[PDB]
Symmetry: C3
Subunit: 136 residues, 3 copies
Amino acid sequence: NSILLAAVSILSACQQSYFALQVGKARLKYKVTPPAVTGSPEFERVFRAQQNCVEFYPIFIITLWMAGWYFNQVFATCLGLVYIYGRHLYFWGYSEAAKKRITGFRLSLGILALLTLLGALGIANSFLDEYLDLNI
Amino acid sequence: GNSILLAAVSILSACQQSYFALQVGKARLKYKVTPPAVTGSPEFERVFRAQQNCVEFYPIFIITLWMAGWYFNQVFATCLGLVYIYGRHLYFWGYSEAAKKRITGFRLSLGILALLTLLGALGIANSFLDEYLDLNIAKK
Amino acid sequence: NSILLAAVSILSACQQSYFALQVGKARLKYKVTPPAVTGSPEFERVFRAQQNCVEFYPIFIITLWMAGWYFNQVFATCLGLVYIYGRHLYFWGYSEAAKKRITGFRLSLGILALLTLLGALGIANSFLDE
Ligand SMILES: N[C@@H](CCC(=O)N[C@@H](CS(=O)(=O)O)C(=O)NCC(=O)O)C(=O)O
Ligand SMILES: N[C@@H](CCC(=O)N[C@@H](CS(=O)(=O)O)C(=O)NCC(=O)O)C(=O)O
Ligand SMILES: N[C@@H](CCC(=O)N[C@@H](CS(=O)(=O)O)C(=O)NCC(=O)O)C(=O)O
């Protein structure tokens, strides 16, 4: 009963890995050898890009599964895919120019804030169903 | 079903995370630090490093919360969960003001975490015996 | 039954905590007072080391549980242990010299990429039966 959620989660974790590869690729192109995190405009953008995806990734996974379990698996899955796409736009946009990230960032944050809300409703909804009412 | 309290704490915790991230985005405006910069003001560097610290501990906390939650007791884990959330509000806002004023916040969250870890470990160990050689001390 | 997955997960989270302690220890040895993240080669290596484990940790936990549930708990558990060990080699190798992180990194990344695939199979496998 969590098969779709699990599918989205492994994709999402591939996008994360693939983002991390791109950063390792930039350390070669722009000659930023560890433990450096600065030394090229081009590199600083690609680095901070994924860093942003890393710091939001746990938030997304929690909200995805909580909406997924407690409200509707299929809707959460779809919003999940939208988020994946939002972060593709974020990363590649940011990589080009800092200013070109916002479209990516706004839709990712949208979908997140939405999953949060659907999760919270679904949890509240089930909190009544372990007290009396199951709203239909 | 069995995890409604854990799920509640988790959504709240993930809001604190988002709310912290908003505050940093707000400081990039106040202290005029445009991406991809992470430095250029003492005030901004503290607010940035603050949540960065919460980001790097957040997965640790979620694992330990659910593992204590499932394998020991949902209700105790939930409450300790709330304590941690509060501890990190003290950490972030303390740090934001002065570096030195973060410690009370940090030592709390660390306390609660290290506790969740232990309750999780007992509960997992406890169930590992009761799937192989019985572990239940229920005498009185 | 997810008892073995839960066991690995708590250990992995202890390694994470322990790595974070080591960085806090380096802020004392190399006198890097917050909010600084630079000012010693020795400190920058120990800092970037854990940062790297933090940014992979959620990836690992998802892939661990997805391979664990959807394919086989016991195989995933073992690969789990391997990853833990791989990251001990990564962190401590990096801490000494940047160059001596690679064996740690290649194996951690190997096991991850493997768990990913075992997870993907196991999900696909169950998608055919529903
Ligand atoms: N996202 C990573 C880059 C991808 C990665 O994980 N890189 C590994 C392997 S490679 O970059 O050496 O190919 C690493 O050593 N991380 C560098 C570091 O973060 O210290 C980063 O923070 O630089
Ligand atoms: N947590 C972020 C700030 C919050 C955030 O995610 N902000 C987005 C959008 S904005 O606040 O810059 O419009 C970003 O791209 N942050 C910069 C970055 O992470 O490189 C940070 O570490 O700077
Ligand atoms: N992971 C931390 C080191 C361990 C830690 O959490 N340190 C805390 C408390 S202590 O190290 O000062 O006692 C901190 O304030 N780190 C915030 C920061 O990273 O800027 C780091 O990135 O430096």
